[model samples]
Target chain A: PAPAEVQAATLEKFIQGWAGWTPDGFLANWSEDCTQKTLPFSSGVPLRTRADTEKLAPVLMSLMSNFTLDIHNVVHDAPQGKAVIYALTKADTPFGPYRNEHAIFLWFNEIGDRVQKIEEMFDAVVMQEFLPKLDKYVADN
Target chain B: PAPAEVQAATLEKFIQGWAGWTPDGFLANWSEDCTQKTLPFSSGVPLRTRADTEKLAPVLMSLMSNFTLDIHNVVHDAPQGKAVIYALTKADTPFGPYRNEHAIFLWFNEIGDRVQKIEEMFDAVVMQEFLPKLDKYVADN
Candidate 1:
């Protein structure tokens, strides 16, 4: 089991890295050969690479800025080497700013030092509403 | 191994339950005393009893009515009694209409007959954008 401090630090660093637009900082929290499946606005589209994630940083960073999260719960299933983080977040976006609740499920290696796989889940339509011009912005720019 | 017909029926029934906003239909797929943990939104909140779920149904049904989902890339781990459903959802709400993608991790029970627990994870900011008026609506009404 990862110590609570380690887990907290890892998540804090990840959130900061993401908000700061530092791909390297985020990647530092992941295993070198880690696999990540991001279900962003288009559910089920597989995004499974550091390179792919690197390319995604700008788009995500552009959409939301100065993001802050209130960690609500952290559950670790030691036998499964998995952990789930539940959080509330507030942020500014190209579309606008809003607050919402969400969660992340991380499947870690036995050591629990870094995540081997990460699955992100969230409500998409609610997100789209905040940015009325989202499609156009994504398409035109 | 479950028959193809059974598997197809299961998926179909599951989707229909969500699309139809039939709380009873959805509950039919859940085991007795099913556990539901919705994160950040309500920390340590578990719908541990059927009565708890029943009370929560109206709010969920209202939300469901304003949305449609397109399921994609479903992966079923039958032996493990688990499945992941990935989809894109278009939602109409007081704030506006928007589309976002999401994923759900469902854990089944021993009989593989019903869902015992559901660990829903998702992006908060995206949801907030579309349902910007959610907090107020829930509070006022």
Candidate 2:
């Protein structure tokens, strides 16, 4: 397996930068062709490219303050260039105080370099409940 | 790291047996003191023991026909007695057909013998959507 620390640091950087809220800065670790998909709710959803993420990241960050991602564990399969992140999120959003559990699977580029693909699984109930509130917030603000 | 095959087998068995849909048979792999929690929507929720699962499993199974759990990947940290399951669910239900993605974390007992704790994360949106239909199904049936 790849060195555990290296994999952990890669994921940590992503989370910390994501919390930083700059679209380019936050997505720095993603490869040019990296694709992402969110689960359950995303059954029929198309995979999003880094460019697609760029479009939405700022909007999402704009809605939240004090965003923090708590990573409970990072399971690494260095040989396979894969890692799984068990994490939780907390933030103050226009919708309300938001929190959710997350399981993110990442596939790294050759030799475990930049991330190539990401599959994110999170509480869809929280998301469904938050959408209307988010719509109202966006409309009012 | 623990043997990959062993950990994979353990998780495979869990998925296969769970598909069988008999509460007792499905839960057979759970240790006596096993605990389970569903995330996001489960915030502030109490952890449930194997006994609690026994009560709910049958009820859940009754709601759906042709239930199936499709495993996408099983990330194992055998040495640490931990495994993460990336999966999807499909079934026929009174509410209609059900499909959702899932990420489940499992912690095994010492020596990776039996499952000790489980944290299950699935699309809460799907559950929320299905529930009223489930309630109506129970009332009419």
Candidate 3:
């Protein structure tokens, strides 16, 4: 296992991408074969590689603006190259203001600098309601 | 900060209660003033104490049978008395079969034996659908 601080630094870089809304930067640290699941069964697309993320990122980002993440707690298992984050997102969307909370699990590569796998769960109930509104906005435009 | 092993043991006991469907046993390790939020923003009841859990657990249990938990990953921050679990639940329910994944964050008391706060997120899209089915079942019976 790499030192905890090393993993922590990598995580900070990873978060900076999201906080800054840089899709490419966010995907930069993901290993080529990384796997991701957006949980609650089928709330969103599953990305298998950086290419998959590249394809989806912009589309998802298009739905919102002024995005910011508010992290509540983080638990790190440095020995295992894993960390769990409890966070909230505030964004301006086509439908209106969107606020949601998320639980994200990150598994890093052996060296702890690149992420190898990701699983995330969020406020699907809020999303369930918001999707229809988004659909209508897309349909009308 | 508690020893990681001690927190691990306590967490094991906590999980056993859920796996065995013993609500009392599950709540036993919760501090009296424990605060619990069933997340995704308004998906279910928020529990503020053992009394609140006691009220909600039986109602929730009544809707399911043959419950079992499938824990996929856990990240522990023993120094902070925190742990995050990525898990799935399989059960026989009034609406039919039920399976959902969860991101659960646990914050334990200083000594790490009792849980002081819990925030949980699950497949709320699935739950949003299931609720209407449950409502009809109750209305009919």
Candidate 4:
């Protein structure tokens, strides 16, 4: 099992990966078998995967320059071997600056050294406001 | 313990209840002592509830209309006493229509009849696009 400090460090690493626009930095925190389940952009869409995440990084980097994330809260349920982090983020966009609040739930295996799965939630409204043309951009590119 | 089918039915009922604008419909799926924890909205805010769901129902209903949800996939782990539903949803609004793909994680107690906790995740960009001016409407009213 990872110590509390290790878990905290992993979370920090994940956030830094995003802020730095380095997907490799973020992937370092995950186990090779790490899986993520997220809400879809539409009803029938499937949960995104590591490959999907990789495909998204460049697009996100282009849309957000100098992204920064502030980790607000981290709750670890040692008994359940799970942890959740709440975060607020700011990014410089071509349109303007934007702020986002969100949460990530990390479910760990028996060892607790690696996250087996991650579930994320965030302010969808804020995303819509800042990335009004994102859909078109993605589609066109 | 409720049967797996009953638990599934209860989950669908809870979702339909929200889509139908009947907050009370959730009671059918949740345990009396159910607890809910929503991820942060902006920064330090944490939306957690046990009995406050009903109070928040009206707010959700007022903000959304003509809701339609499509359940794409579901996994019921009868042995582990859990179930998850993957869904996509679209709703009508005065400004425009909004769509999202999301997942709901249902954790059940021994009987598998009642949901002890529910967690949800979805894309935030869509919401960000639509909701910034809500304060103006509420204020005018």
Candidate 5:
């Protein structure tokens, strides 16, 4: 298994950078072909490449006007190249203030730094209310 | 840290019981106070009691029909209290036939061999297709 410190740092850097996330900065953390998993309440399909994920930046930026991701444990074990990062969002958005819990599973390369995949999970109950507001936010903004 | 063999065996035991699962048997793997995490597509909240989790038995049994939980690579290490179990399902269903990929995370007691929590993830593409069928089945069954 990869060392926990290295895994933590990689995710820390990526998340910390999300406040000013850019296409160039995305390359440093994610591999060119890094895949992103989407659940039912999420996009509902895998985002297959870095470019594919990059497309979401502006939408997120426009919706979440200002956000702070309060991160917690980054659990690492057994799976030689994977770890799970936990967090909750605190943000100001077109839809008003937002707070949502999140779990992101990261898959790293054998040497332990470059990320290959990021699978995300969030509370569905929270989204039930957030979704309609989000749909209207994009339409009006 | 607990022995890898012991942790693996415990997870193996609980899963092997799935062929004829029961609420009582579920306790052998999860404690009475054992907490369960459900995915957005699974449940909207954490299952804080055994009774909460037992409700899923019918939902699962009704969908999978007769199934074999083909599992492999129960990963464990110095984290000492948690392991990840891998499985892919092959089953006969009312929908005709089905197979789905799954990755289960199991957290054990400090001394090991008794699970405290179980969280699951799967191919959402399959689940996106499975959900409507599940809703209809649950509604009719």
Candidate 6:
């Protein structure tokens, strides 16, 4: 849709939020039916609506506690979409510590005013002892 | 750890199977404890074991009916134990025609014989009207 240069810079800052665990103007980009599924594991349901994700904001601050999610390639290619975050997502959970890599292939809607899907993948083995107890707490789960 | 070149080629062909809709040798790369979670949206339980993924092969082929996953990049940073697919996945589903993208971030075990995790993401909005009827035609979804 837009030029790659324009998209790259905008896309880069959006993804950096996850690693530094920052959401700098992140939530402002999603639509009503956007789907948010934590790829590794979770006890609750996938967040399929904007309202569902709005409630997820406060805890995002806590995810940054004492650690950092090292992001490598912040912007990349994707079909009919804005861009991608193809790299590693490093962080530890309440259950255990882990190191793994994954991508959040992001997409936007008709007018680019809202994000429609945000999908991420991570190292599953490292979470062997961690995922099963997810959504229970970050420090609590 | 191996050279980036070696990892990149091996990893490329591994994920290309989905584009060709062939799991020809896909399962041979996963470790038993591999956690299998197709990131977007699905009804069944998350595949938490190797055996869980074995059963997933069939559905993968269905995803490639008349589409192709144009892989963009495959690179590795062995020290980080990470390799990623920063690419564009072009496909049309059963419900409607669509154009979106995907990034499948992969992780491997120490020796690299087994693939520890396989995480894929795509456009969820396109599937909002397409996935419900998928599990039925997808064999044992």
- The lDDT for every candidate, in the order shown, is 0.59, 0.73, 0.76, 0.61, 0.61, 0.54
Best-to-worst order by TM-score is: 3, 2, 5, 4, 1, 6
Each candidate's interface RMSD (Å, one decimal) is 6.4, 2.1, 1.4, 7.6, 4.3, 9.1
Tens-digit lDDT string for candidate 4 (A75-110): 554434566655788889887997776656676655
Q: Give lDDT tens digits, candidate 6, residues B49-132.
A: 666446656565565467766665454545445565655655566755645555566776666555677665544442343344
Which portions of model 5 miss their true places by more than 4 Å?
Answer: A1-5, A18-27, A40-44, A122-141, B19-24, B37-46, B51-64, B68-77, B84-105, B119-141
lDDT of 2 by residue, A1-141 (tens): 346567657766777776676787788989888988767545544567899778768777777788887778767665566778878878898767977777888877664446788988765553455545766887997
Residue-level lDDT of model 1, residues A1-141, one tens digit each, is 565456545656665654455557667777777776645644554556766566655566567678776765555444345565556777786657767665566765555567767766544454344344655687897
TM-score of each: 0.46, 0.78, 0.81, 0.47, 0.64, 0.44
| Highest DockQ model number | 3
Q: Which stretches of candidate 6 lie over 4 Å from their true place?
A: A1-141, B38-48, B92-94, B124-141
lDDT of 6 by residue, A1-141 (tens): 444444455466555544455444556555667776544233233444557456555454555355555555543332354445656444565656534555665665655545677765543342334343555656573
Residue-by-residue lDDT tens digits, candidate 5, B19-120: 454545656677666776544323344344667556555566666667776664354444546666556667887767876655566777666667777766
Minimal lDDT window, size 10, model 4 chain A? A37-46
Stretches of candidate 1 off by over 4 Å are A1-37, A42-141, B1-11, B39-50, B63-66, B98-100, B124-141
Q: Total clashes, candidate 3?
A: 0
Please give, as one word, the docking class of candidate 2: acceptable
- Ten residues in sequence with the least summed lDDT for candidate 2 chain A: A123-132
For model 2, the superposed segments whose C-alpha errors exceed 4 Å read A1-6, A41-43, A93-96, A123-141, B1-5, B41-43, B94-96, B123-141
Candidate number 1, chain A TM-score: 0.65
Residue A113, candidate 4: alpha-carbon lDDT: 54
Q: List the candidate numbers ranked by DockQ, top first.
A: 3, 2, 5, 1, 4, 6
Per-prediction fnat values?
A: 0.22, 0.44, 0.85, 0.15, 0.15, 0.07
Say which candidate scores most in lDDT: 3
Q: Which ten residues in a row have the lowest lDDT in candidate 1 chain B?
A: B39-48
Comparing 3 and 6 on lDDT, the stronger one? 3
- Model 3, A13-118: lDDT tens digits are 8888878776787888788888776676645543446776676577667777999998888898877789988778999988889788778899888887888888
Tens digits of per-residue lDDT for model 3, B1-141 = 677888888888777777777678778878888887777653554444667677656666768799989888888888678998878898997768978877888988878787778888765554345555756898999
